């Protein structure tokens, strides 16, 4: 034919045609695209001449599938020769959106091959139009736990069926190169060895803080490159913006003759919120407009109010809505805001509170339309046009940057990802932006460089080939120059440069540093950079090249102290010439003294800076052919040791500074707990004098207190300092303190320790958090990404490693951690901390009867916290009672507080009491310390009845209004009883208040469920009332410890047979960790009056699993619904001991109710019970106001675990239907568990079941007809847990077994870090390994940034550092370590010679 022309907007730039014209189009290669969707009907989806393809027919395929075990997924046509949906286990591979399919677009880019024209009039091709496509539909739901296993099957399938390259969009911000998820890394190594190029988008988060503000110059570790592409084997791809852009434009023909404005044709950007221009003004219809100066009202009133689309420049003060709305007010019809900054890329507003005028941003100050001076006409194109782009040849804003988390240079290379036009569904095309557009450009190009290498170097093995495909692509790339600043683009942003395909299949040169890689990561840099660059020549003629090295660093806006993410050029240090043998290599030695720049740069980057850049090679004769180059980066400083956390908001405020994400709005020194800072947090709860407080107040920043307005304020003591103090007394007011961090770098090994503050060197921990934590920097790339993280696992509560109470005193609470670089130093951060459990001093005061002046003694605390506030209040009666009860009808919540009203405090320290407003003696005086201890005297308590007189001295004592609740006792012990006691409470069903609990005897069913639900949470011992129990100890022993010799929890000193709490075991170790389900020996020992030793032994069982309610039966009897639950079994620890049917009656409009008992207020569900009939049915009756979803069935096991279901939910099961439920069986507490996993159920022929119905609102419980089935575990968090039982389980539903329980038994995974640190660098030829318990070797390799150190992350276990060592050498030091979970273990080892 005479075919439409090809769009070379991208090919001209990346120089594709230099490869096409040498016969490299992808013919007989295959790209495996792992991604979201694909339409293989698309006209683009085409091969020319199947005869030359890798796979020549639908049968060549079924011949490849069975060949390697793939029993699933079809061949579709000559182009898309394999496709399987790995999420469903489906062959539904096409997405259904607005034709907008991501994976469609990606495939268009790598291998589109259309003959037809898109809407421009051109036809579009990929980099490899003649390559074949296998598509793996693979994508992630949170609901899975980990989609990784799916990606690995797609990778392994792709390899097996014979791909040449794989294209992944997959990414996890702040990847490491050496420690990504190992199952996925190894899958990738496996493709490399099969000669597969693994090409991965680098991510779209850009850099730390990117949704907030540019990064502080004290924080150079701002990189965020993706978790798989950051690995050494993949090719990791950054994105540049296309120079040409295909969009609907706007045209004023009255500006046709301005050729620098694309002939009167503008790029307009409406806000992502609204986008109302097409639907409100309509394409292809012409409208008036009128320049408005000044978006006030003045500006010629409203000339642009008749029909004119209003045209206004941006007022950087007035907001986008103060503008659109003010225009719509004057009659707008729709407004254009044209940019105030000249030459700038159309700011993105979003901004849509009060739009409704149909608005857009017109390109720049440029495109100020001033024809006939304000008046003009304009229309909106309905078809897309080619336009110069307002941001072409710029790095795309969001391409990931920086180094990998562990210090390596990535990404590797750049390609066009901004505004790329490619294929959508249903013969549509569209344009779309991101680093995963750039990635298929490079996937395509490595198709072609592979074709080449295969023709031109046929003696290259599978294993070596993908690594050379990469090294050519990089080394031949065009080093990009930032156009706004005229400086080389950072290699941390652009990699080895912009893609140059021709260069790569033409020059036959590539470059390599010492590490045999197309880029160079030097580690730390010290006043002298020396390194070895190596050029390689695949030609059999030869090349002579002249070279020179440009050295860069990061520019810093000195007004702001923030990186600008642009590079400044230091010095193009000069090189030389060298000649590169045919089929050989030559090595040159670059050397630069940078001593010169240290002072100027250390001044603006006090924690160090990057020294990076390129080494350029040109042909010595003609400097435009044989252009190749290598990137490098080092760190002037100690990259491994950069601060991991931002400094504490305390220290920063104290030195006039602020947090990177800290919102300083509000009253001076407000630290509301929802802001973002490093700090400590604690729980508060109010003190009430007229009723028992029934709920706490939530977390607040420790050291802050509500001021009059209820904002929480960092108060200072007399010396002008905040006070970090907790009062671990049981009252839930500041009883604990926990670390909250704003993390700057990825952290690992994080724990909390408490030392006595006179233990200055932190050598004797008194308490350590039971676990250790690890996590990500708070990079905040958009709203979904936390600006701070709270680690409640670091809660300290004044108990020690033993559970003993640590005395009131002055301690250091030390949070320690490590960055993710081997060899780094442990970073501590210290909080001075008071343990004070003592209320302030209530002495006496001077009341004078006619000045009405109450003045108390000056304020004195007991303990170190210090008095913080002085108060007087009375209880204003209201609805006749001194407190108000408040029922949050929507959250089903009740709260109660005093009607406290406060008397102002005159500056001299006293109070003028309003006795018009209540009696003296109904006023309370209150003194609070900084730890939360609260003293309150009711001053009437010590009033003389001689009221009116002359000034009297009044005695004040505390009323113990702030105390810890205590549990209702009521119990009388006979000698019959065991001695054991536990607690009893019902489970709320509607209200979310804490149900009333009270003590109960325990003379059977020795089983507890430590879940803090009120019911059987502990085992305490209570003695006969007149018996004596001297020296009373409880110890708990594991079942292994049959000699009862090493306790795992013991009563603290001073426990007594009648203080129950002192004796209560809550299934917890001495450290306060929940014990595992199992049996334990609870041993009570005491001496009586006579000194005879007594011991009472009991076997307690711990188990907190909720019971599983099965669907029962329903029958109609005398016209009334009858419910018959299935027979519960009673076989111990889980057997049912309580069975209820009830319903909730509405009263006062709701289903719960408040009752004002003698102590205080209590909340209950309006429960009404249904007698069990003698046939085991319950009669579910008529009852005005009550529907079947108001009737419940409830069960309790011997442990006190409770479950319930509405009868509506149980009745949704047909009478012929059965129910199967799937779950995981982990040997840990319910709060320590995965719940996330997906599964496939197949019917008796192997067909996936369709049209799912769920049982009792659980997506792990299905309603199915009777039959044979199988279930297969699809996904689960494989970093957290290992499957142990069968992955496929067969089961049969039937009217007898109409409820099946299928569980996948699992074990749980725990890692540790090990670092071996040496004295002096080890001699050449030494090898370091970890030797495992079974005798195997785990090789370690030198740390880049810390070369005396070798480390790895391992499975929790016992290891020994073995070292191989030549000549006469020896290692001394402890080489053995028993790792702990999430811990970091350092072995300092010593190298010795003679």
Instruction: Supply the minimum distance, in Å, between the C-beta of residue 601 and Ca ion.
Output: 19
Q: Considering beta carbons, is residue 85 or 235 the nearer one to Ca ion?
A: 85
Structure tokens, 1064: 């209560």
Instruction: Supply the minimum distance, in Å, between the C-beta of residue 440 and Ca ion.
Output: 12
Instruction: Supply the minimum distance, in Å, between the C-beta of residue 151 and Ca ion.
Output: 22
Q: Considering beta carbons, is residue 180 or 823 the nearer one to Ca ion?
A: 823
Find out whether 1356 is annotated in a ligand binding site: yes
Please name the residues in contact with 1188: beta carbons below 8 A apart, sequence gap of 6 or more. Answer: 1121, 1180, 1206, 1207, 1208, 1211
> Would you say 827 and 645 are in contact if contact means Cβ atoms under 8 Å apart?
yes
Residue 1120 binds Ca ion, judged by CB under 5 A = no
Find out whether 1141 is annotated in a ligand binding site: no
Residue 423 binds Ca ion, judged by CB under 5 A = yes
- Give the position of tokens 């036809």: 123
Q: Considering beta carbons, is residue 1154 or 1199 the nearer one to Ca ion?
A: 1199
Find out whether 784 is annotated in a ligand binding site: no
Sole window of 124-132, 236-244, 276-284, 952-960 interacting with Ca ion (rule: CB under 5 A): 124-132
Residue 623 appears among annotated catalytic residues: no
Instruction: Supply the minimum distance, in Å, between the C-beta of residue 83 and Ca ion.
Output: 15
Instruction: Supply the minimum distance, in Å, between the C-beta of residue 866 and Ca ion.
Output: 7
Sole window of 22-30, 430-438, 634-642, 745-753 interacting with Ca ion (rule: CB under 5 A): 634-642
Instruction: Supply the minimum distance, in Å, between the C-beta of residue 426 and Ca ion.
Output: 12
Q: Considering beta carbons, is residue 158 or 903 the nearer one to Ca ion?
A: 903
197-201: strand order across its sheet: 80-85, 132-137, 30-35, 165-168, 197-201, 235-241, 413-418
Find out whether 641 is annotated in a ligand binding site: no
Residue 146 binds Ca ion, judged by CB under 5 A = no
Find out whether 21 is annotated in a ligand binding site: no
Which residues between 874 and 933 bind Ca ion (CB under 5 A)?
Answer: 929, 932-933
> Would you say 1209 and 1256 are in contact if contact means Cβ atoms under 8 Å apart?
yes
| DSSP tag of 1110 | -
Give the largest Cα separation in the chain, rounded: 119
Find out whether 756 is annotated in a ligand binding site: yes
Residue of the chain from 251, 339, 414, 729 that contacts Ca ion (CB under 5 A)? 729
CA 996 to chain centre: 37
Please name the residues in contact with 1: beta carbons below 8 A apart, sequence gap of 6 or more. Answer: 115
Structure tokens, 210: 């990117």
Q: Considering beta carbons, is residue 445 or 985 the nearer one to Ca ion?
A: 985
Which residues between 1335 and 1394 bind Ca ion (CB under 5 A)?
Answer: 1349, 1381
Q: Considering beta carbons, is residue 526 or 579 the nearer one to Ca ion?
A: 526
Residue of the chain from 679, 684, 979, 1125 that contacts Ca ion (CB under 5 A)? 684
Whole-angstrom distance, CA of residue 1179 vs CA of residue 1114: 10
The H-or-E segment that residue 263 falls in is none
Find out whether 861 is annotated in a ligand binding site: yes
> Would you say 308 and 302 are in contact if contact means Cβ atoms under 8 Å apart?
no
Sole window of 206-214, 679-687, 798-806, 1045-1053 interacting with Ca ion (rule: CB under 5 A): 679-687
* Residue from 9, 35, 808, 1197 carrying the catalytic annotation: 35
φ, ψ of residue 704 in degrees (nearest 5): -105, 155
Residue 1077 binds Ca ion, judged by CB under 5 A = no
Whole-angstrom distance, CA of residue 347 vs CA of residue 334: 18
Which residues between 81 and 120 bind Ca ion (CB under 5 A)?
Answer: 108, 112, 114
Start-to-end CA span in the chain (Å): 83
Residue 236 appears among annotated catalytic residues: no
Find out whether 638 is annotated in a ligand binding site: yes
In order of 56, 153, 158, 161, 868, the CA distances from 84 in angstroms are: 19, 11, 11, 13, 67
Q: Considering beta carbons, is residue 1130 or 1310 the nearer one to Ca ion?
A: 1310
Q: Considering beta carbons, is residue 162 or 863 the nearer one to Ca ion?
A: 863
How many residues bind Ca ion, per CB under 5 A?
34
Residue 1067 binds Ca ion, judged by CB under 5 A = no
Residue 727 binds Ca ion, judged by CB under 5 A = yes
Find out whether 197 is annotated in a ligand binding site: no
| Pair type for strands 1167-1169 and 1161-1165 | unpaired
Instruction: Supply the minimum distance, in Å, between the C-beta of residue 135 and Ca ion.
Output: 15
Which residues share a beta bridge with 1183?
none
Whole-angstrom distance, CA of residue 1216 vs CA of residue 1114: 12
Residue 1015 binds Ca ion, judged by CB under 5 A = yes
Residue 405 binds Ca ion, judged by CB under 5 A = no
In 594-637, where do the E strands start and end? 609-619, 628-636
Instruction: Supply the minimum distance, in Å, between the C-beta of residue 128 and Ca ion.
Output: 13
Inter-axis angle of helices 102-111 and 435-456, nearest 10: 30
Instruction: Name which of 483, 433, 106 is nearest 245 in CA terms.
Output: 433
Instruction: Name which of 774, 604, 671 is nearest 1311 in CA terms.
Output: 774
Whole-angstrom distance, CA of residue 292 vs CA of residue 324: 12
| Pair type for strands 628-636 and 609-619 | antiparallel
Sole window of 201-209, 421-429, 656-664, 1190-1198 interacting with Ca ion (rule: CB under 5 A): 421-429
| DSSP tag of 217 | T
Instruction: Supply the minimum distance, in Å, between the C-beta of residue 836 and Ca ion.
Output: 4
Q: Considering beta carbons, is residue 150 or 821 the nearer one to Ca ion?
A: 821
Residue 9 binds Ca ion, judged by CB under 5 A = no
In order of 77, 1214, 1296, 1299, the CA distances from 1217 in angstroms are: 42, 5, 11, 9
Residue 1200 binds Ca ion, judged by CB under 5 A = yes
Neighbours of 152 (CB within 10 A): 20
Find out whether 733 is annotated in a ligand binding site: yes
Residue of the chain from 124, 639, 813, 1178 that contacts Ca ion (CB under 5 A)? 124
* Residue from 236, 269, 360, 436 carrying the catalytic annotation: 436
- Give the position of tokens 């724990």: 751
- Give the position of tokens 């002008």: 720
Residue 35 appears among annotated catalytic residues: yes
Find out whether 848 is annotated in a ligand binding site: no
Structure tokens, 186: 């190894």
Neighbours of 839 (CB within 10 A): 24
Instruction: Name which of 303, 241, 275 is nearest 438 in CA terms.
Output: 241
In order of 477, 502, 1149, the CA distances from 412 in angstroms are: 10, 18, 65
Sole window of 123-131, 482-490, 598-606, 1092-1100 interacting with Ca ion (rule: CB under 5 A): 123-131
φ, ψ of residue 1142 in degrees (nearest 5): -150, 180
Which residues between 836 and 875 bind Ca ion (CB under 5 A)?
Answer: 836, 838, 861, 863, 865, 871
> Would you say 873 and 903 are in contact if contact means Cβ atoms under 8 Å apart?
yes
Instruction: Give the length of the chain.
Output: 1394
Residue 1312 binds Ca ion, judged by CB under 5 A = no
Find out whether 647 is annotated in a ligand binding site: no
Find out whether 759 is annotated in a ligand binding site: yes
The H-or-E segment that residue 1363 falls in is strand 1358-1363
Sole window of 498-506, 648-656, 738-746, 1010-1018 interacting with Ca ion (rule: CB under 5 A): 1010-1018
Q: Considering beta carbons, is residue 590 or 834 the nearer one to Ca ion?
A: 834
Q: Considering beta carbons, is residue 334 or 1010 the nearer one to Ca ion?
A: 1010
* Residue from 102, 105, 536, 991 carrying the catalytic annotation: 102
Q: Considering beta carbons, is residue 577 or 1012 the nearer one to Ca ion?
A: 1012
Whole-angstrom distance, CA of residue 173 vs CA of residue 1313: 21
- Binding-site annotation, residues for Ca(2+): 223, 225, 235, 638, 640, 727, 729, 731, 733, 735, 756, 759, 836, 838, 861-862, 928-929, 1009, 1011, 1013, 1015, 1017, 1317, 1356
- Residues near Ca ion (CB under 5 A) are 44, 108, 112, 114, 124, 423, 638, 684, 727, 729, 731, 733, 735, 823, 836, 838, 861, 863, 865, 871, 929, 932-933, 1009, 1011, 1013, 1015-1017, 1200, 1310, 1317, 1349, 1381
Active site members: 35, 102, 436
């Amino acid at each position: 034919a005479s075919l439409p022309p090809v769009n070379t907007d991208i090919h001209d730039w990346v120089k594709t045609k230099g490869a096409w014209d040498k016969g490299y189009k992808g013919q007989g290669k295959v790209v495996a695209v792992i991604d979201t969707g694909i339409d293989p009907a698309h006209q683009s989806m085409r091969i020319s001449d199947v005869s030359t393809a890798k796979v020549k027919s639908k049968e060549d395929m079924l011949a490849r599938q069975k060949a390697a075990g793939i029993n699933y997924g079809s061949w579709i046509n000559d182009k898309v020769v394999f496709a399987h949906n790995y999420v469903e286990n489906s062959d539904n591979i096409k997405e259904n959106q607005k034709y907008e399919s991501h994976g469609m677009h990606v495939t268009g880019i790598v291998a589109g091959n259309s003959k037809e024209a898109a809407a421009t009039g051109e036809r579009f091709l990929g980099i490899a139009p003649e390559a074949q496509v296998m598509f793996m539909r693979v994508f992630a739901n949170d609901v899975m736990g980990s989609a990784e296993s799916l990606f690995i099957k797609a990778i392994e399938d792709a390899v097996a069926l014979g791909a040449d390259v794989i294209n992944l969009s997959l990414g996890t911000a702040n990847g490491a190169q050496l420690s990504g998820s190992k199952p996925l890394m190894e899958a990738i190594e496996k493709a490399k060895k099969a000669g597969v190029s693994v090409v991965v988008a680098a991510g779209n988060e850009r850099v730390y803080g990117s949704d907030h503000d540019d990064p502080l110059a004290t924080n150079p570790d701002y990189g965020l490159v993706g978790s798989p592409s950051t690995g050494r084997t993949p090719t990791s791809v950054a994105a540049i913006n296309s120079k040409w852009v295909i969009q609907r434009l706007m045209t004023v023909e009255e500006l046709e003759k301005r050729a620098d404005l694309n002939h009167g044709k503008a790029i307009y950007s409406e806000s992502v919120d609204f986008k109302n221009i097409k639907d409100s003004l309509g394409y292809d219809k012409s409208h008036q407009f009128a320049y408005v100066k000044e978006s006030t009202d003045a500006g010629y009133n409203a000339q642009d109010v008749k029909g004119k689309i209003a045209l206004i420049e941006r007022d950087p003060n007035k907001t986008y809505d103060e503008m659109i709305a003010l225009a719509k007010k004057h009659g707008a019809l729709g407004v254009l805001i044209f940019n105030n900054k000249p030459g700038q890329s159309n700011r993105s507003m979003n901004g849509m509170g009060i739009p409704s005028a149909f608005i857009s941003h017109e390109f720049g100050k440029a495109m100020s339309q001033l024809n006939g001076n304000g008046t003009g006409s304009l229309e909106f194109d309905s078809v897309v046009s080619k336009a110069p782009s307002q941001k072409g040849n710029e790095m795309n804003h969001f391409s990931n940057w920086g180094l990998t988390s562990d210090g390596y240079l990535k990404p590797d290379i750049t390609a066009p990802g901004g505004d790329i036009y490619s294929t959508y569904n249903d013969n549509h095309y569209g344009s779309q932006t991101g680093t995963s557009m750039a990635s298929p450009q490079i996937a395509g190009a490595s198709l072609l460089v592979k074709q080449y290498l295969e023709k031109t170097q046929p003696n290259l093995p599978k294993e070596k080939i993908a690594d050379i495909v990469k090294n050519l692509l990089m080394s031949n790339a065009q080093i990009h120059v930032n156009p706004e600043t005229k400086t080389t683009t950072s290699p941390r942003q652009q990699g080895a440069g912009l893609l140059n395909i021709d260069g790569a299949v033409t020059s036959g040169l590539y470059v390599t540093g010492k590490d045999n890689y197309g880029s160079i990561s030097l580690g730390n840099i010290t006043d002298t950079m020396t390194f070895d660059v190596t050029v390689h020549n695949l030609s059999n003629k030869d090349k002579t090249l002249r070279y020179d090295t440009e050295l860069l660093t990061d520019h810093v806006d000195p007004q702001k102290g923030r990186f600008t993410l642009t590079s400044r050029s230091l010095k193009t240090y000069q090189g030389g010439e060298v000649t590169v043998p045919a089929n050989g290599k030559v090595t040159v030695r670059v050397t630069m003294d940078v001593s010169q720049f240290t002072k100027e740069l250390t001044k603006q980057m006090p924690n160090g800076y990057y020294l990076e850049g390129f080494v350029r090679f040109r042909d010595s004769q003609d400097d435009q052919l044989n252009r190749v180059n290598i990137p490098f980066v080092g760190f002037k400083g100690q990259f491994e040791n950069l601060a991991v956390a931002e400094e504490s908001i305390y220290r920063l405020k104290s030195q006039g500074k602020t947090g990177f994400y800290f919102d300083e709005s509000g009253p001076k020194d407000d630290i509301y707990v929802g802001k973002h800072f490093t700090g400590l947090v604690t729980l508060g709860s109010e003190t009430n004098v007229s009723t028992k407080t029934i709920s706490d107040n939530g977390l607040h920043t420790l050291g802050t207190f509500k001021n009059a307005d209820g904002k929480f304020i960092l108060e200072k003591n007399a010396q002008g300092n905040p006070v970090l103090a907790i009062s671990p007394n049981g009252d839930n007011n500041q009883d604990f303190a926990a670390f909250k961090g704003v993390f700057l770098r990825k952290y690992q090994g994080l724990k909390a320790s408490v030392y006595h503050a006179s233990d200055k060197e932190h050598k004797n921990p008194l308490w350590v958090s039971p676990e250790s934590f690890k996590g990500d920097k708070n990079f905040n790339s958009d709203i979904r990404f936390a600006k701070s993280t709270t680690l409640l696992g670091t809660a300290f509560s004044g108990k020690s490693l033993t559970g003993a109470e640590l005395p009131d005193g002055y301690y250091h609470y030390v949070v320690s951690y490590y960055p993710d670089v081997v060899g780094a130093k442990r970073q501590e951060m210290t909080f001075d901390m008071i343990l004070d459990r003592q209320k302030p001093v209530l002495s006496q005061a001077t009341f004078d009867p006619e000045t009405n002046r109450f003045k108390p003694e000056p304020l004195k605390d007991r303990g170190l916290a210090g008095v913080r506030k002085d108060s007087v209040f009375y209880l204003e009666r209201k609805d006749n009672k001194p407190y108000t009860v408040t029922i949050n009808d929507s959250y089903k919540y009740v709260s109660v507080e005093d009607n406290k009203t406060f008397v102002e405090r005159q500056a001299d320290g006293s109070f003028i009491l309003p006795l018009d407003k209540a009696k003296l003696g109904d006023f309370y005086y209150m003194v609070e310390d900084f730890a939360g201890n609260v003293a309150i005297a009711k001053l009437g308590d010590h009033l003389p009845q001689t009221l009116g007189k002359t000034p009297i001295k009044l005695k004040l004592t505390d009323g113990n209004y702030q105390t810890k609740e205590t549990l209702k006792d009521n119990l009388e012990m006979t000698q019959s009883d065991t001695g054991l006691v536990t607690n009893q409470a019902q489970l709320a069903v509607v209200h979310r208040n804490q149900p009333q609990s009270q003590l109960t005897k325990m003379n059977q069913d020795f089983f507890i469920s430590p879940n803090e639900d009120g019911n059987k949470d502990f085992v305490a011992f209570k003695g006969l009332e007149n018996n004596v129990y001297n020296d009373l100890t409880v110890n708990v022993y594991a079942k292994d410890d049959h000699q009862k010799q090493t306790p795992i929890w013991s009563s603290q000193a001073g426990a007594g047979a009648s203080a129950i709490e002192s004796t209560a075991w809550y299934g917890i170790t001495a450290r306060g960790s929940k014990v595992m389900p199992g049996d334990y020996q609870y041993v009570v020992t005491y001496r009586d009056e006579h000194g005879k030793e007594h011991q009472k032994q009991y076997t307690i069982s711990v188990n907190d699993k909720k019971p599983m309610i099965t669907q029962g039966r329903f029958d109609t009897i005398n016209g009334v619904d009858h419910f018959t639950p299935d027979k519960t079994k009673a076989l111990g620890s889980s057997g049912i001991v309580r069975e209820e049917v009830f319903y909730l009656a509405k009263k006062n409009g709701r289903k719960f109710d408040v009752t004002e008992g003698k102590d205080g207020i209590t909340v209950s569900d309006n429960k009404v019970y249904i007698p069990k009939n003698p046939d085991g049915s319950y009669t579910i009756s008529k009852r005005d106001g009550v529907t079947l979803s108001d009737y419940y069935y409830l069960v309790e096991d011997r442990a006190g675990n409770v479950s319930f279901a509405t009868l509506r939910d149980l009745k949704a099961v047909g009478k012929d239907k059965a129910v199967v439920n799937f779950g995981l069986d982990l040997p840990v507490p319910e709060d320590k568990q995965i719940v996330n996993f997906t599964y496939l159920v197949r019917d008796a022929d192997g067909k996936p079941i369709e049209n799912l119905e769920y049982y009792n609102n659980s997506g792990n419980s299905l309603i199915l007809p009777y039959g044979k089935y199988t279930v297969e575990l699809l996904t689960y968090d494989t970093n957290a847990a290992k499957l142990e039982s069968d992955k496929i389980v067969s089961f049969t539903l039937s009217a007898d077994n109409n409820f099946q329980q299928v569980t996948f038994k699992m074990t749980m995974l725990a890692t540790s870090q090990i670092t071996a640190h040496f004295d002096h660098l080890l001699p050449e030829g030494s090898r370091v390994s970890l030797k495992t318990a079974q005798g195997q070797l785990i090789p370690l390799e030198q740390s880049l940034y810390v070369p005396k150190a070798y480390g790895k992350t391992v499975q929790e276990g016992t290891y020994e550092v073995v070292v191989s060592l030549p000549k006469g050498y020896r290692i001394e030091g402890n080489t053995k370590v028993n790792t702990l979970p999430n811990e970091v273990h350092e072995l300092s080892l010593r190298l010795v010679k003679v």
